[PDB]
Design a protein around this ligand. Structure first.
Ligand SMILES: NC(=O)c1ccc[n+]([C@@H]2O[C@H](COP(=O)([O-])OP(=O)(O)OC[C@H]3O[C@@H](n4cnc5c(N)ncnc54)[C@H](O)[C@@H]3O)[C@@H](O)[C@H]2O)c1
Ligand SMILES: NC(=O)c1ccc[n+]([C@@H]2O[C@H](COP(=O)([O-])OP(=O)(O)OC[C@H]3O[C@@H](n4cnc5c(N)ncnc54)[C@H](O)[C@@H]3O)[C@@H](O)[C@H]2O)c1
Ligand SMILES: NC(=O)c1ccc[n+]([C@@H]2O[C@H](COP(=O)([O-])OP(=O)(O)OC[C@H]3O[C@@H](n4cnc5c(N)ncnc54)[C@H](O)[C@@H]3O)[C@@H](O)[C@H]2O)c1
Ligand SMILES: NC(=O)c1ccc[n+]([C@@H]2O[C@H](COP(=O)([O-])OP(=O)(O)OC[C@H]3O[C@@H](n4cnc5c(N)ncnc54)[C@H](O)[C@@H]3O)[C@@H](O)[C@H]2O)c1
Lengths: 359, 359, 359, 359
């Protein structure tokens, strides 16, 4: 017959002519050569989350390269200056950068990428939950092993093997942590009692960083570079266990949240611009983004996480939700990559931080 | 031709005869009648997450009905006794029950289901992040409104409308919270200074529950029933904001984590059995499950959350991972429902808690 | 000191006064009674996906109750008339309804809810992938059993036990299917050869429905009610296996896609309005939504699935994407519930289809 | 006091000493240099999905390098020989390789990586849904543009702009496709009528590949290298639309599934070993894995997809489920990467296919 006219008209509508960029991947070379830099450059034009990874690289580079001319009479406010450690290259920046990491990222090999950022003061403030605090120190005492996601936990428990995803922390590691930290907690309580020291999570994490005295440790580098590290639920993990058992041997330690919320929420107020790089969700994400409401919004933003907004969670909220709160500025152009961080962070570092440090 | 013999042999293997239950849904009645009780009863045999919901109902009923005969010379250790509020039905239990909730569940209408559990002391300890603490009190001052997931946050911010998923909290609600809480913080600091009171998150949440003095509030009922509520990152939210601004008007408040980790981790040690019901992930999940390591494992367990274990997160970890740590006992038969809680909790309550209370 | 003025101004902005509905859950009764109808009624005001479930119930009720006055000279075009089966209640409708289901929903106990809809001609066209076609017939020969998600597949294979999620299909079930279907395929090929019959997936599924001749079967009811069932990849499953082995014993069967794409894409063109209810994603979702482009868009739409749009997949695309294509009309108000269907479909049926049938 | 002895004993259990590999990331160089090869090499030891990506690279390299000594009297059965195109490097292999791709991967820039594999006959059989068939040809006529996930579909439709995730296909592209394909369908129907040609999806896709006659096209290279391409729902997309409208101008085309299920399910039976690389889920995943049941299982397997098994879907099923069916051999060591393919495929190619081609 003749096809229905409504179908013809609906399937074959006219379209606007577009001048936007085109979708195009990197073409691997016909001789087997593989150009990683062209691969990385084309991610922005590959679509779906590869495109968001490219936009996130762009966003971090805007943080690293932001500059301005101070108002008459003002001096320039700079960040990333470092703690003057011999031989360590630092690069001053006009944008202050906050890093949030979930604890499992320190369990993973991302620890080595994060350490690189903190060693060179390429971020200025870190928020990390308690697991990521303690496991950085524990890794200076004993390693975490490769395992598998599907191995019966009954068998692991009978062997004293604690599972974190497809990783294994033998429980002996925590006995070694106990041996290391108990004399430090004794000294901290002695200083509280005799010198009036008022402990908070950030002050304790600074002290533990100096104590571990080991260049393999992220929080050692944070302490050496005077990078504050906040962790308002610092007792939610093995450090909490150590505080628990310590307190029956030596009672009276106080760990205060109030001083640390003053200090955290004041962190974004001096800088001309702030950038936030949030790897994972939960407390570290809300703590950083809420602090940035105090300056009427973060100016540059990257989220990388596996959450989605359909459950109403803070973890899953899009950057757009944070705009409604004032936690992201009205002028920002934020980026979320929907991905597991171990697949993403290495290429983010290659495309932004490392290139910047090489200038 | 003749089909390949390897294909014949591989496609048509013999099978073992099984005596396990059969998959079978509820058959709605041909006249339009719908029997919700038969619907609920058949979930266990429907497959996929409906089956897990049925198993979770079974698991909670095992918590509610667990009983034992004390050893010679011992008395029976009971829970769920309540605070003797007039007219309120309570039901003593030999299993102690921990409830963990993410903050957004209090933003949602799940607040009414959770309030029911706390009012009747059908749970004994709650862990809830700061958002769920404050928004329960705020809802006694002003309501949260229905919105949508896709409404530009630039427009919302210009209108002072804070978005939580598809919900809206007008910022005026937080000004009302400020008016309500500032005199309380003044009094708490006065008691710290003159009576030596040592504030912790759980002690403060108890006090705020009594202060709101309103039967619509979950944490009012927790305080009246002497149900401890822990929240180790209590500053990660609007209460943190209020503490911040209060502290410039009236400095010196201390909010201690150490006493609260002693108290939290001792909560599981008296009971003959413990059950854990964890709605959502993050801090509330780790805090409860880790506490239960101190008794060598929780005995009954239900998780309901939208996370998955592939990212190595604590939120996404299966119950099997907690077994490896000793946080779930070797003899437990735990259940996870992979689902958004607002779709699940009402039917869990119908199938377990409500039926129990009606006995 | 004095708190920073920028922080004061940013945290305490003024807000617009709102007249939108309020978030409010159902309050279970203090004596243990549980009112499922009030539970269901309040889902719309509970937030997150409970709200979307309430909106989806509303959307389906709009399909079931849509009515109009024909233009002068026209008669009213009605659907849901049924096939005149004795004793079966039917309810004519002016909105034509398409149902899409993934194969695993027939493996599950949702088979009983879907059968209810098809028996009463509460939907007019179904699209279902091959697994859901064959397993409906197989369940008339032998049942599917309950199993578990975590049981080593090496052990299951050695026992001839095929796993579908937490369900088990003993391989003997497929040998029984072979015995049942081979004489039918013989007859179909005989009719092709002697009567010129031109087989398509929808024509074959109709024939298999009549052959099974069993009121337990969804596709039996579809055939009796002259509900077309499309499945353009009908060979992607056990029916494909049976066609394969049959063809070496008796070659020449032809199964044509061309006639079936004419017939599928013409299905939406007569009705005054169309509604689409898509349970799961993949082929069934694209096939139905694309067909509705031929009328310039579906008028009412519900999606229920576990996919997300971040991967660019057709499965994960929001209704908004289908609007851009013309597959959903510009005036529609579509609804997606982000959830596993076994947790959702029973309450959708209770709130819409069953209530409608009871009128 | 003294800490409870049960807590001491439970928190500080003894652990087995392990000899398994250690978690360790790549350490970016302190001068800003970034070694992509060491990055890639360390993924296996980074944890979570980076580890699975490393294992997937290993699995593909096992496919590419598998070799064997034929039994006495047999000759070696080889694959990847190519179609003798001048200048194109091919590498014979004893393992036959199946590639499955969802349609959106051809919409994306992954088209360029996939084309590389097909051009060099580094895979032997492809299964791709209809969207990925047509959009490869359409891209030879007009490009796909970059867009965004959040742009109102009402506005896009009024402009004739079809959205695929964050990509845009102007509808004019489909009018150009119509102009290109209608004379081909005319000729195919002429050959059916005058020469008895029996069209199937794979035979049509071969013909369209030769017709486009363009080295930018994946399916051109498949046809030139005699790589069969299966697509049992080939009408589920724009090719289906074109067949629809063509059939009213020129009726009688038949597109048969039966011959194509014989041919697909026979593809795995000759090779000494088979490997399956499945990018995305749905039909392409089931079609390939089910075919491999016919040889009693695939020997090497990589899945990369964003699905999870909790919904019982075929898309979300772990490799372990396919073992239960016999679709994966009992001796295989399969790998799934839980990730969006655009973030994963480039590094899979760099680590396996490209290195292999360079030998
Ligand atoms: N994970 C550990 O190693 C460990 C150890 C001890 C204590 N804990 C405690 O558990 C509690 C909760 O842990 P948490 O705050 O680190 O967050 P979490 O593990 O609850 O994760 C929060 C969300 O962040 C996202 N996320 C997590 N890992 C991701 C990844 N690799 N890639 C992308 N997104 C990811 C996910 O959406 C997840 O749901 C903390 O208080 C922590 O101290 C954790
Ligand atoms: N959400 C709010 O209303 C709000 C308000 C103020 C502050 N905050 C703060 O954000 C921080 C993180 O929030 P959080 O600890 O409540 O958890 P979260 O929002 O980070 O969620 C943790 C994980 O729990 C799961 N989850 C969340 N909601 C779920 C749901 N409805 N159904 C099933 N699973 C769900 C998800 O996997 C999610 O990734 C807290 O410190 C909180 O105080 C939240
Ligand atoms: N699953 C079986 O029982 C079975 C048996 C034989 C053959 N197959 C074949 O596998 C192929 C692919 O299967 P399919 O088309 O049914 O879809 P699928 O299993 O590939 O699912 C497609 C998407 O739909 C969503 N989905 C699936 N189940 C869901 C659920 N319970 N709740 C919410 N969303 C859900 C998910 O996002 C999933 O990724 C088909 O050709 C089918 O014939 C399946
Ligand atoms: N997507 C298009 O461009 C397009 C165009 C026309 C027609 N269609 C039709 O839609 C139907 C369904 O599409 P489909 O079979 O391609 O699969 P799908 O889009 O239904 O995806 C199936 C599952 O595969 C996984 N997946 C999809 N994209 C992924 C990604 N980038 N990374 C990781 N995992 C991913 C996801 O779990 C998804 O649920 C097909 O018949 C197709 O022809 C699609």
């Amino acid at each position: 017959s003749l096809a229905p006219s409504l179908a013809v008209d609906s399937v074959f509508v006219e379209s606007e002519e577009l001048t936007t960029p085109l979708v195009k991947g990197y073409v691997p070379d016909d001789n087997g050569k593989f150009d990683f830099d062209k691969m990385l450059e084309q991610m922005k034009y590959c679509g779906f989350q590869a495109t968001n990874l490219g936009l996130a690289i762009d966003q971090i580079n805007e943080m690293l390269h932001y500059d301005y001319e101070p108002q008459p009479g003002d001096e320039k406010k700079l960040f990333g200056l470092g703690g003057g450690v011999e031989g360590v290259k630092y690069k001053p920046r006009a944008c202050k950068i906050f890093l949030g990491i979930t604890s499992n990222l320190i369990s993973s090999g991302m620890r080595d990428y994060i350490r690189f950022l903190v060693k060179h003061a390429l971020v200025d403030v870190v928020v990390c939950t308690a697991g990521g605090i303690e496991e950085d120190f524990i890794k200076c005492l004993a390693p975490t092993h490769m395992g598998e996601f599907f191995h019966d936990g009954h068998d692991l428990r009978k062997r004293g093997l604690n599972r974190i995803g497809n990783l294994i922390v033998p429980n002996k590691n925590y006995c070694l942590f106990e041996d290391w930290i108990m004399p430090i907690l004794d000294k901290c309580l002695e200083e509280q009692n005799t010198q009036g020291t008022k402990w908070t999570p950030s002050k304790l994490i600074h002290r533990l960083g100096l104590e571990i005295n080991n260049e393999d440790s992220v929080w050692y580098w944070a302490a050496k570079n005077n990078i504050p590290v906040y962790s308002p639920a610092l007792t939610d993990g093995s450090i909490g266990d150590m505080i628990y058992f310590h307190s029956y041997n030596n009672p009276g330690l106080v760990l205060d949240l109030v001083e640390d919320i003053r200090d955290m929420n004041n962190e974004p107020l001096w800088a001309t611009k702030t950038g936030c790089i949030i790897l994972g969700g939960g407390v570290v994400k809300h703590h950083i983004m809420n602090a940035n409401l105090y300056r009427n919004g973060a100016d540059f933003v990257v989220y990388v996480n596996t959450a989605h907004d359909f459950d109403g969670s803070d973890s899953g909220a899009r950057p757009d939700e944070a705009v409604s709160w004032g936690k992201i500025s009205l002028e920002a152009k934020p980026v979320k990559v929907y991905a597991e961080v171990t697949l993403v962070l290495p290429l983010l570092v290659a495309g932004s931080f490392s290139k910047f440090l090489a200038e």
